[PDB]
Amino acid sequence: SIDYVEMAVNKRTVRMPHQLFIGGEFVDAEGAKTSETINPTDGSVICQVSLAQVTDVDKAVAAAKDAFENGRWGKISARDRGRLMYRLADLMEQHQEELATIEALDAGAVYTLALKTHVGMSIQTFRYFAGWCDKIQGSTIPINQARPNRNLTLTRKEPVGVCGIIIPWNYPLMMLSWKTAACLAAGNTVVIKPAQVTPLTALKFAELTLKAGIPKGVVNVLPGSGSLVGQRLSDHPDVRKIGFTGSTEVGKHIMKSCAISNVKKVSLELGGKSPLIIFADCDLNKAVQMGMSSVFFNKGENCIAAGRLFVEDSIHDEFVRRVVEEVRKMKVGNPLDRDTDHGPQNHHAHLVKLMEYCQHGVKEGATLVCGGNQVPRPGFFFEPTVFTDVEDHMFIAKEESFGPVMIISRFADGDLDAVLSRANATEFGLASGVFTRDINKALYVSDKLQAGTVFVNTYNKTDVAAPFGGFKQSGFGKDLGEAALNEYLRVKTVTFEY
Amino acid sequence: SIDYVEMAVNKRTVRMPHQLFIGGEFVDAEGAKTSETINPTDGSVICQVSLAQVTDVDKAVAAAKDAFENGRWGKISARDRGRLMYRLADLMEQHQEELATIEALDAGAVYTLALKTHVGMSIQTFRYFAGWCDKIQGSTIPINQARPNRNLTLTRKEPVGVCGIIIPWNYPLMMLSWKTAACLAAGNTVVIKPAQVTPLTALKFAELTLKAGIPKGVVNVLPGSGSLVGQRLSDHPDVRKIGFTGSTEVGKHIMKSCAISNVKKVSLELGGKSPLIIFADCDLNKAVQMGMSSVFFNKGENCIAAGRLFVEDSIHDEFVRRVVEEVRKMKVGNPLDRDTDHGPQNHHAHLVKLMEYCQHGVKEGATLVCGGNQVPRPGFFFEPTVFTDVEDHMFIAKEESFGPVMIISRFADGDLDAVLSRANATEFGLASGVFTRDINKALYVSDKLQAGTVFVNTYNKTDVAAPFGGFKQSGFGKDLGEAALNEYLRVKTVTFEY
Amino acid sequence: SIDYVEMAVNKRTVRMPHQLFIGGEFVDAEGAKTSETINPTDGSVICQVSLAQVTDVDKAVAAAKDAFENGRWGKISARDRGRLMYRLADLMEQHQEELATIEALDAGAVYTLALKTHVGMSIQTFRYFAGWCDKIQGSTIPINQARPNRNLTLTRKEPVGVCGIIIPWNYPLMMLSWKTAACLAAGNTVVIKPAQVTPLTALKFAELTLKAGIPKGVVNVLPGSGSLVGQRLSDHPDVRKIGFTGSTEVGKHIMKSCAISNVKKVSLELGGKSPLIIFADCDLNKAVQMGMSSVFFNKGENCIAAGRLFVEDSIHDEFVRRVVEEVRKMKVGNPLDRDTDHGPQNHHAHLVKLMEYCQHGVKEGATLVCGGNQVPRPGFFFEPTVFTDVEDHMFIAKEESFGPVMIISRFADGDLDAVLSRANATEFGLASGVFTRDINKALYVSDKLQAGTVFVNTYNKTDVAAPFGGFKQSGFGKDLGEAALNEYLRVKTVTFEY
Amino acid sequence: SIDYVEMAVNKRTVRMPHQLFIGGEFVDAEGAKTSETINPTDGSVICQVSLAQVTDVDKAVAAAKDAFENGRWGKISARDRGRLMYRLADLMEQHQEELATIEALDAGAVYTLALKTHVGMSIQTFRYFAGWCDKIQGSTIPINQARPNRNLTLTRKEPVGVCGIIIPWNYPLMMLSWKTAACLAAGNTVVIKPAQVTPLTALKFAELTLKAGIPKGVVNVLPGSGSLVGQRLSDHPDVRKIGFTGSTEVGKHIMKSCAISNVKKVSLELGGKSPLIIFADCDLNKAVQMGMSSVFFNKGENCIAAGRLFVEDSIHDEFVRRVVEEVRKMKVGNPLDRDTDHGPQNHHAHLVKLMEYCQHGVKEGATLVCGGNQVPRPGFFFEPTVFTDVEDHMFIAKEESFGPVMIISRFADGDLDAVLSRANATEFGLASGVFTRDINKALYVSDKLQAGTVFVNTYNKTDVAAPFGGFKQSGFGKDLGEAALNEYLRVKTVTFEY
Ligand SMILES: Cc1cc2c(C(C)C)c(O)c(O)c(C=O)c2c(O)c1-c1c(C)cc2c(C(C)C)c(O)c(O)c(C=O)c2c1O
């Protein structure tokens, strides 16, 4: 009998769950504590959400150890687990207008992608990663056949324990499923520390599993403070695995728990500085458009998006002045409004956090080729900014903006390794990109970039079986791929003899 | 023109290298600093060995970045790399009397295994792991074939960088090669922080590569202090990977560098508490002998050896009183002496470090069924001790002895899960064992033990293609196997389109 | 608008397809030719089925070359192919009472397995082998990196062409899916030459794909004469691959087309002489029961079933006299009748074909310990026969019975290699078996048997990811496993350079 | 005490073995039968070689079943087998002047490649394929873990039996080793039916194994008649495997034994019609030279060499008239003579067999742009011929020449699929080629060619780890690669339970 302040918004009764779903039920935090959520389109508040404490971390990793151990999920055969996980996708996509508008409402994400991605892109990873439940294998090798005896082996892939779930702030709901598939499938159960700014898409998901009847205590979400609930899950002895994506900061401090508390594996992701090295030889009509889609996607709140958009001289002002036109083409409106092409940032201070970045570089001597300050309306709409020719020593060409701020640079006509060593030199080593058509110019674009997905001639390809991770300065541990069930599952050995 | 105080010992001119082989040559430490080595058979000293400083860690990870980058090893085709690594095995096994007697002399290891293991067991892993040089593969998947375009992919396996080499103290030379194969092969070069108590087997190896002409700066060894040279390699920015085996201690403090300095992967191993659950149903003649070989091997200095030798009641005193006879059968003598069946421990205080362990349990109420104190001769020979019936709460049945101290326990006749939950409860989760013949009693021995190599009906199988690692409380990262070239090699992605 | 003589039988409207589904539709043979089907429970006929000609083999391998080339299946991306193949499993298992009762009706298979296997066992291999559609890989090696140039490679796995489908007679429907998964998945399309005695389970499957909307001309089934339709598919130039299981005869004559017509690969399976070497040490209660289930399964029409049931002396009459009781325990009734434990053979003359086998050995001097002749009822029920002690030179201990005729032999108490060389000497080298508990007696049971699945302590394990084939005298080419997509997919090479 | 008519030729005592090395010794054929060898440089004879009978095929496959079964090779551990096979490479390359000049003398091969390839290229495949002796693996999967029991598996890779060795006529010695590595390594032994025209390089190899002391009866070579010794090995029951490369003819008649005699696997290769589709965009200086090296290599006796050298219009006469100059540049001389760039064909009538091919096309209307008839000197030197513009219907543009007869065609400037469908239409589907630099023109060159090694921008790369085979009309079964030990080794299954 969970309570909801029923929100008949966007032609649908939005019920975004408030409680802390634990032990089979949604419940409040310590003493009926709470934590609100913000309407980023206006700065408004939406509703009340309980915010757990260190009172709860004693409860989640002990109550979600029920599903792991005793009930249905702990032991049911390989089929119905996926077959139950698969039925989730049956209910969920039916209610995309729930997860579309909600994530259109929670994190202000535009409705146009709120339908395609914010439910659709989740519908895929439910069914692609619900695959390997009854399909995962041993691989068991030729042990020493010890004469005069006869030997054997069979290693295997086994679940680990209980896991940590730190969804980032930017992509709240869809990046729940991207970490609700590779975690549950490996045999274990989950306990989620969502983003509390937009936790209402996250908490909305588990209610469907309620009807969907997954074994009790298999999935439990947990809003909370920044580094208490995270740390309290970051140090508990019971927890076995840990999922997070966010700043570069939290890890080097959170990764000191893992040197101490319980040596359990770690899974952290950091934002990046993808250099999108556009030559001019590619089709200039698409060198700008998908180039313009390369950065300004989903109002700039893109995880890997390339904020250093190199261009050859021959098309720069061309690419600029055309893109300069394209910077004007966008729509700023209600994300649930179909025509909306640009919405507000996630949060209030962050629009500040982006603007000074603009202000930083502009003071350096940066060609503020448009905007750079807040769109003059409630919420935190920001003017899509376009710098120019900013070299590396400046502060804008090193910091992660976290905004739709196209921050160009430039090089010599046809350069391969030098300026791309201005694409190679950034320590944020997540993504990359390139455009080209003569691929005697894509033979040296993708070999040498020490990046984690060394694209060529495209970008923006959020698709389920693209196995993904990051290199040095944005984490380790791969998501959205087969290795996702490479670490999540523990390797046993055996060694018989007769 | 390296200098050696030529040691014509054991019918052979022992030249154990003293210097710090860097930049292509063996050289001394800071200001001609040194660090001695101990003769564990007598407590004597052998010779002088320079001990590097933080002056050197600026030199190794910058000079061994030469082989990686510019010379032969950085770029030569896949064949001659193994073909050069393979020629190493041509020279080395010819001089087993070098690495046999030396390791018979350095770490006091008996000659009987000094020939079979301390060179022979190294001769294997040179040639089994010199295999995959020109044999390692991509595995490149079906990317979204994006209509109306046509797509592709090809991931790959790439070297990482420069690595850290902390050979443990116990198995000095052979465990060099076990980490001189999986490291060099992946494309990178190596820099070795050996055990300085017995660094003279370690430093002896690289001289053969000198004749063997491996590319310069590919292999460089480095004696040094405990946690300076280790830490100074534990924090440098240049270093990319790190190899160590030793105490459980150093990691939880060393693993705080990896949360900070440069996030590079880690590879650490800790000693263990393998419960060797001998039923009586196995052949009692071999239930004792290989059981007796299960612990007392190479004078107790065994990395995974089972120091909790469970036995059913029916054979306990039988297994005891027979093994009690077998505890007497052993030889204590010069390890290079063929008849020697038991030598001294590694080091002086450690024989203390083992004896109080004996003294600890005996004060608890432990049946000191023999010995327990130092063999009355120079060096640090120790009397093979046999306790009995020691339950878990005591200090001996929880601590790692690090000695040939057979520390029994006991259970009910035919028990499967309970007493093996006294085999399951220890957090040192490296090895295991079991004996049995009716393998309706090996169906529940090996499934449930949360250990890393869940043996059945044998033990002691140091062989090259037995892929090995540890579980929770002794590290993470697998050695001596195919996954050894699973982490050492970085995964790239590509994504074309036409 | 396919026609069906609607059969409201077994509480369900059996529509078993009659036509020759080609070019997208079910259609009749040459000139409206036909070929009937037999009710094996009674000798009755069920309905009319067109029987194609050499008029059709010009049509199938030219019309099913449509799906391969132009329509949806030829080019759709990796996902929906499985996603369309997966939706097949959505419809099909819903109508198990169709494929259960039909195969309960077509081939007289008992309903008890008609539900579990004759639809259930097909439901698995739809979903396990619908896996590898979007999951199959290249594996692309280190080509000579030719200095002063720079090289590469990427091999791949590609579909072959059009294939040949000869389902055997015994397991009509379920062995359709076992060859409807590994064939379709590799990129190609299929054309089926089913068993015309029981083609009504086979032809029933493709109607569901009609609703299931697989690309046109991807699947086409074809009843026909014995060695015309088979030969006419055995010699056509267009056909690229060929699937068949049946007698040892047809191949050595059919394999002369492959030396001539078009050199395309071949896939043939032959029945076998699995020696099921039961020691007595195994649990005698299960040494008989699963031993009795080892032969008499699905009324003896078992593909690999062990018809030489060795036993130690100590239990022979015991195992006999108990099994002698068990030979009486069985039910002979309507296969769709739940209590039915034994049904008729497939066909009329075959019950003859089995009885003389009985008659053969009995004339030799065989202890006809029960029955041996026809059950006195319509259809062709046969009395479960049990011989004894028949040695090898006789005709029964060499011929394939193709019946539930438990044909024992015997040996010395505890013999390992000699009598098992009466298990080793038979050239039918498909299966094997053994029972044992002390597995110092399963150390020499399974090493030396030159068989294709060298079982120990079980049998009867028809499961999807058990990769299966045969050795010398029963074919070559493996089914029900990963190598199934090892041959079906052609290996390309490439070799770049820059 | 083998006899040799000692030939102190080429500054070295050529001992080419005459006998039939069987049962450990070299011996003569039936009744001291013989079979000569021809000096192709002059038509001269070299010496006497016994030619076995069907008297011998009773001896080889029974005497070489000794090594397989009883002696050293049957059972010695994995190391020394390669270690003995590896020592072969120690002796053999030392005597390259033996195998260089001999093959310079036997098959008239030029000394320039007689050193690099005819011993050097053999020295590689001895050591690359002597690798996998002690390195080959199981791969043993997750069998149904059948609750309430606990299951396992371990498949493996096992030797097959005795094999058939039909070295072709063209590349006599080096193609011995290419089939002396993948055969011996898999556990079995070998019996060689070499080319009797040039059997003196072949028979020369096994003498070194005599000193090299491989286990007796592991290797036995056998000169003989065309289709008796081949057929007599083609039908024997004992033989298990079969190796041959030669005409397209012998197989479709020899492959009728395999449908009958003993169903054992088959390995046959046929010559090809590689279309070497040179665009003009590639460097025209190398478009001719390596193009000219693409066909005229080792005096035209090239197994896969592209005898249909397409060219764009823009460079045709250019490529022609320059290559026309290059057709003149070559040297015709003694193959052991260093300056020799062109030698005679293998045999007397074959130079006829090539000339009428010239005569065939020239009568069709072919531009005989040079030569076309015999070089006017003893032996069978042939004038390097260059046709032009010959379209497909003619006889020269369909037949395999088997000569250095550059037989051009032509197309439209920049054509991709049409004229390459004159590269795609030939049913000889072994090799291919292409030149290009803008690899928007190598994106459609290599995808669609139904060939077995779909080259781009190079050719002529005989290297050991290039896994090789053929497509439809030149055989099946891959050589010089990892799959070479994919078929040669039989797959076992096991299936335990507890
Ligand atoms: C991967 C693939 C899947 C296809 C499928 C799926 C959905 C089953 C079809 O259904 C289908 O109809 C296809 C036919 O078009 C088809 C197809 O062509 C390819 C393909 C492609 C796109 C490019 C290749 C290249 C490029 C660099 C040009 C190679 O270099 C190369 O070597 C290849 C070979 O491996 C190679 C190749 O196989």
Residue B58 corresponds to which tokens in the numbers above?
A: 């600026």
Residues, chain A, total?
A: 498
Q: Angle at Cα A293 formed by Cα A288 and Cα A297, nearest 5°?
A: 155
Of the candidate CATH numbers 2.60.120.460, 3.40.309.10, 3.40.50.300, 1.20.140.10, the domain formed by A272-463 belongs to 3.40.309.10
Give the separation between CA D271 and CA A150, rounded to whole angstroms. 46
Ordered DSSP codes for B329-351 = H--BS-TTSTT--B---SSHHHH
- Determine whether the interchain pair D154/A152 forms a contact, defined as Cβ–Cβ distance below 8 Å: yes
Out of D150, D443, D465, name the one closest to residue B134 (CB).
D465
Is D438 part of the contact surface with chain A (CB cutoff 8 Å)? yes
The Cα–Cα gap between A21 and A28 comes to 8
- Confirm if A111 and A462 have CB atoms less than 8 A apart: no
Cα(B419)–Cα(B440) distance, integer angstroms: 17
> Token match 């460097």: residue?
D283
d(CA C459, CA C431): 9
Ligand 1 atom nearest to B151, measured from its CA: 22
Q: Please, is B156 exposed, middle or buried when counting C-beta atoms within 10 Å of its C-beta (0-12, 13-18, 19+)?
A: buried
Give the whole-angstrom CA distance, residue A256 versus residue A231: 11
Beta-carbon separation of B258 and A263 below 8 A? no
Instruction: Report the DSSP pairing between strands D490-492 and D156-158.
Output: antiparallel
Cis peptide bond prior to B148, omega within 30° of 0: yes
Could you tell me the CA-to-CA distances from C388 to C330, C365, C410, C413 in Å, in that order?
A: 20, 10, 8, 17
Q: Cβ contacts (< 8 Å) between D483 and chain C: which residues?
A: 491
In angstroms, the CA A404 to CA A406 distance is 6
- Mutation site for B-interface testing, chosen from C72, C137, C158, C446 by largest number of B Cβ within 10 Å: C137
- d(CA D397, ligand 1 centre) in Å: 29
Distance CA A25, CA A28 (A): 10
Q: Is B137 on the interface with C (CB under 8 A)?
A: yes
Beta bridge partners of A244: A166, A268
Note whether A285 contacts D: Cβ–Cβ < 8 A.
Answer: no
Residue D1 touches partner A, C-beta closer than 8 Å: no
Q: B448 is written with which tokens?
A: 């449930």
Instruction: Sort out which chain A residues have CB atoms less than 8 A from D142's CB and list them.
Output: 136-138, 140, 154, 156
Nearest to D182 by CA among D476, D468, D491, D475: D468
Kindly determine whether residue B447 and residue D150, on different chains, have CB atoms separated by under 8 Å: yes
Which residue in this structure is represented by tokens 């541990």? A477
Closest CA to B19 of B178, B206, B173: B206
Which amino acid is it at D10?
N
| Distance separating alpha carbons of residues C300 and C345, to the nearest angstrom | 8
DSSP letter assigned to residue D275:
B
Closest residue by Cα to atom 24, ligand 1, is: D447
Beta-strand relationship, D12-14 and B7-9: unpaired
Count of CB atoms within 10 A of residue C73's CB? Answer: 24
Q: Residue D206 corresponds to which amino acid?
A: A
Residue tagged active-site, from B98, B103, B269, B487 = B269
Pocket test for ligand 1, best of B144, B145, B497 (most atoms within 8 A of CB): B145
Of A304, A291, A384, nearest to A344 (Cα)? A384
Q: Are strands D454-455 and C268-270 parallel, antiparallel or unpaired?
A: unpaired
Helices (H), A260-337: 284-295, 316-329
Is the preceding peptide bond at C148 cis, omega within 30 degrees of 0?
A: yes
**Dist. CA C156 → ligand 1 center (Å):** 9
Separation between Cα atoms, residue D441 and residue D33, nearest integer Å: 58
**Which residues have CB under 6 Å of ligand 1?**
B 145, 150, 152; C 74-75, 77-78, 156, 158, 187, 492, 494; D 443, 446-447
Angle at A353 between CA A347 and CA A354, to 5 degrees: 95
CATH 3.40.605.10 domain residues, chain B: 7-267+477-492
Nearest chain A residue to D142 by CA distance is A138
C443 touches B: beta carbon within 8 Å: no
Ligand 1 center to B145 CA (angstroms) = 9
Pick from D319, D314, D294: which is nearest to D304 by CA? D294
Distance B138 CA to ligand 1 centre (A): 18
Tokens of B21: 């082989």
With b for 16 or more beta-carbon neighbours within 10 A and e for fewer, the D328-348 pattern comes to eebebbbbbeeebbbbbbbbe
D373 within 8 A of D383, measured Cβ to Cβ:
yes
Q: Which of D125, D126, D127, D134 to mutate to test the interface with B (most CBs of B within 10 A)?
A: D134
Q: Dump strand ranges (E) for D357-474.
A: 433-435, 454-455
Nearest CB neighbour to A135, from listed C79, C128, C439: C128
The string of DSSP codes covering A46-82 is --------HHHHHHHHHHTHHHHHTSSTTT--HHHHH
Please tell me which chains touch D, using 3 or more CB pairs under 8 Å as the contact test: A, B, C
With a CB cutoff of 8 Å and minimum separation 6, the contacts of D321 are none
Q: Give the whole-angstrom CA distance, residue A243 versus residue A163.
A: 7
Domain A7-267+477-492: give its CATH code.
3.40.605.10
How far, in Å, from the CA of B142 to the mean position of ligand 1?
A: 10
What's the rounded Cα separation, in Å, for the pair C421 and C426? 8
Q: Is the dihedral of CA D402, D407, D412, D413 positive or negative?
A: positive
Whole-number Cα distances in Å, D235 to B105, D256, D304: 63, 10, 29
Backbone dihedral region of A14: left (phi > 0), alpha (psi from -120 to 50 degrees) or beta? beta
H or E element in which residue D230 lies: helix D229-235
- The contacts of residue C80 (CB under 8 Å, 6+ apart) are none
Whether residue B214 contacts residue B88, with contact meaning beta carbons closer than 8 Å, is answered with yes
* Strand pairing class (D12-14; D490-492): unpaired
Structural Rg of chain D based on CA atoms: 24
Residue pair D65/D188 in contact by the 8 Å Cβ criterion: no
Q: Between A and D, how many CB-CB pairs are < 8 A?
A: 52
Show the tokens assigned to B313: 């009641």
Intervals of CATH 3.40.605.10 along chain D: 7-271
CA distances from C30 to B225, B277, C19, C237 (A): 91, 73, 11, 21
List, by residue range, all CATH 3.40.309.10 domains of chain D.
272-463
Residue with tokens 């969804």: A167
Report the DSSP beta bridge partners of residue B192. Answer: B165, B221
User: What was the structure determination method?
Assistant: cryo-EM
Residue (of B113, B93, B95) closest to B104 by Cα position: B113
Q: How many other CB atoms sit within 10 Å of the CB of residue D367? A: 14
Burial class (CB in 10 A: 0-12, 13-18, 19+), B317: middle
Q: What is the C-alpha end-to-end distance of chain D, expressed in Å? A: 59
Rounded to the nearest angstrom, the minimum Cα separation between B465 and chain A is 7
- Cα separation, B239 vs B261, whole angstroms: 10
Residue A490 host element (H or E): strand A490-492
Secondary element (H or E) of residue B434: strand B433-435
Do B16 and B102 form a contact (C-beta atoms < 8 A)?
yes
Catalytic annotation, residues of A: 269, 303
* Total residues found in chain B within this entry: 498
**Closest partner residue to D456 among C141, C461, C494, by Cβ?**
C494
Distance CA C439, CA D498 (A): 11
CA terminus-to-terminus distance, chain B: 59
User: Domain spanning D7-271 has what CATH number?
Assistant: 3.40.605.10
Cβ pair D366, D357 in contact under 8 A: no
Q: Is B44 annotated as a binding residue?
A: no
Axis-axis angle for helices C199-212, C78-94 (nearest 10): 120
Burial C452-466 (b: 16+ CB within 10 A, else e): bbbbbbbbeebbbbb
Query: Is the four-CA dihedral A236, A240, A245, A249 of positive or negative sign?
Result: positive
Q: Do the Cβ atoms of A131 and C128 come within 8 Å?
A: no
d(C-alpha B57, C-alpha D239), whole Å:
63
Gap between the Cα atoms of A4 and A204, Å rounded: 11
DSSP H helical ranges for B213-329: 229-235, 249-254, 284-295, 316-329
CA distance B333 to C277: 53
Q: Which parts of D373-453 are beta strand (E)?
A: 433-435
Which DSSP helix (H) or strand (E) runs through A200? helix A199-212
HEC profile of chain C: CCCCCCEEECCEEECCCCCCCECCECCCCHHHCCCCCEECCCCEECCCCCCCCHHHHHHHHHHCHHHHHCCCCCCCCHHHHHHHHHHHHHHHHHCHHHHHHHHHHHCCCCHHHHHHHHHHHHHHHHHHHCHHHHCCCCCCCCCCCCCCCCECCCCEEECCCECCEECCCCCCCHHHHCCCCCCHHHCCEEEEECCCCCHHHHHHHHHHHHHHCCCCCCEEECCCCCCCHHHHHHHCCCCCCCEEEECCHHHHHHCCCCCCCCCCCCCEEECCCCEEEECCCCCHHHHHHHHHHHHCCCCCCCCCCCCECCECHHHHHHHHHHHHHHHHHCCECCCCCCCCCECCCCCHHHHHHHHHHHHHHHHHCCCCCCCCCECCCCCCCECCCECCCCCCCCCCCCCCCCCCCECCCCCCCCCCCCCCHHHHCCCCCCCCEEECCECCCCCCCCCCCCCCCEECCCCCCCCCCCCECCCHHHEECCECCCCHHHHCCEEECEECEC
The beta-carbon neighbor of C145 closest among B78, B136, B139 is B78
Q: What are the E-state strand segments in D201-251?
A: 219-221, 243-246
Residue A190's contacts (CB-CB under 8 Å, 6 or more residues apart) are A64, A162, A163, A165, A180, A183, A184, A218, A219, A220
Asked if B134 reaches chain C (Cβ–Cβ under 8 Å), the answer is yes
Q: DSSP string of A213-236?
A: TPPTTSEEE----TTTHHHHHHH-
In angstroms, the CA D317 to CA D320 distance is 4
Name the DSSP class of A370. Answer: S
